[PDB]
Design a protein around this motif. Structure first.
Motif, short mmCIF file in Angstrom:
data_model
loop_
_atom_site.label_atom_id
_atom_site.label_comp_id
_atom_site.label_asym_id
_atom_site.label_seq_id
_atom_site.Cartn_x
_atom_site.Cartn_y
_atom_site.Cartn_z
N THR A 40 0.85 -1.21 0.00
CA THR A 40 0.00 0.00 0.00
C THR A 40 0.89 1.26 0.00
O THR A 40 0.49 2.25 -0.66
CB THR A 40 -0.92 -0.01 1.21
N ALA A 62 -6.95 -0.56 -1.05
CA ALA A 62 -6.04 -0.75 0.09
C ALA A 62 -6.78 -1.56 1.14
O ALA A 62 -7.77 -1.05 1.79
CB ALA A 62 -5.61 0.58 0.66
N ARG A 64 -7.91 -3.50 4.56
CA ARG A 64 -7.85 -3.34 6.03
C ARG A 64 -8.61 -4.53 6.62
O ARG A 64 -9.52 -5.04 5.92
CB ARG A 64 -8.49 -2.03 6.48
N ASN A 70 -4.82 -1.41 9.07
CA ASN A 70 -4.05 -1.55 7.82
C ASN A 70 -3.54 -3.01 7.66
O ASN A 70 -2.99 -3.58 8.63
CB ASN A 70 -2.81 -0.64 7.88
N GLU A 72 -1.56 -3.44 4.65
CA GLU A 72 -0.42 -3.08 3.76
C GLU A 72 -0.49 -3.77 2.40
O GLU A 72 0.52 -3.69 1.68
CB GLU A 72 0.89 -3.31 4.51
N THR A 131 2.58 3.09 11.22
CA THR A 131 1.19 2.66 10.95
C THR A 131 0.91 1.30 11.59
O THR A 131 1.56 0.31 11.23
CB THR A 131 0.95 2.59 9.44
N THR A 133 -0.26 -2.22 11.88
CA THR A 133 -0.48 -3.15 10.74
C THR A 133 -0.72 -4.54 11.31
O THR A 133 -0.01 -4.92 12.25
CB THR A 133 0.71 -3.12 9.77
#
Ligand SMILES: CCn1cnc2ccccc21
Length: 182
Positions: A40, A62, A64, A70, A72, A131, A133
């Protein structure tokens, strides 16, 4: 050099392209039809370069998880005149740990690169570049800039794409069969 490298080569030779965005060149795995994946952080837009050819992006999502965390992975549908070999039957159905994986990269900087990374842990949560993840795989190899998008395989399975590292460990986002049901 051995059967792991054999499976990895078979994936690289038919199911990868070189993707270029404004954020760099990435190994990009084609999964089926005109559907591919990329990290991403590549920031895919309306236009992408595929093997140095200007290509319209028909869709980009993207991913999730259902906690709105997230993963990625971005799934891209390309306005390309050719389909990928369908490799969805090589995708795992569940989160798992693995033995004896290979990370394979193909860019202008790193052509025909294969790395035996050894044991892969279901690491889970990672703070990736700030972020939060989920669904992260970890291997104890000092991966470097240029390897994002690299394909992680075992014999018979395509398990993830490389998304980062800390200088000593490398991290991949899981690929699951459920991401690519049409
Ligand atoms: C530190 C090991 N390593 C990781 N990526 C590489 C690329 C070329 C040579 C060595 C490399």
């Amino acid at each position: 050099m051995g059967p792991g490298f054999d499976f990895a080569q078979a994936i690289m030779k038919k199911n990868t392209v070189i993707a270029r965005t404004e954020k760099g060149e990435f190994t990009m795995l084609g999964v089926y039809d005109r559907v591919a994946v990329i990290p991403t952080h590549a920031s895919v837009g309306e236009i992408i370069y595929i093997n140095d050819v200007e290509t319209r992006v028909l869709d980009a999502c993207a991913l999730r998880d259902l906690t709105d965390t997230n993963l990625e992975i971005t799934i891209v549908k390309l306005d390309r005149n050719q389909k990928f070999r369908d490799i969805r039957h090589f995708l795992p159905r569940c989160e798992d740990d693995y033995n004896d994986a290979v990370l394979s990269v193909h860019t202008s900087k790193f052509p025909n690169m294969y790395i035996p990374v050894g044991q892969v842990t279901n690491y889970g949560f990672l703070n990736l570049g700030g972020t939060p993840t989920h669904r992260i795989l970890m291997y104890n190899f000092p991966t470097r800039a240029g390897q994002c998008g690299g394909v992680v395989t075992t014999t018979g399975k395509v398990i993830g794409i490389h998304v980062g590292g800390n200088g000593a460990q490398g991290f991949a986002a899981m690929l699951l069969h459920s991401y690519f049901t049409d």
